[PDB]
Amino acid sequence: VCCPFGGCHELCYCCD
Helix, strand or coil: CCCCCCCCCCCCCCCC
């Protein structure tokens, strides 16, 4: 799944 707003950092390609 994508990384939600309360989750996304540079690490996470998808990034909500």
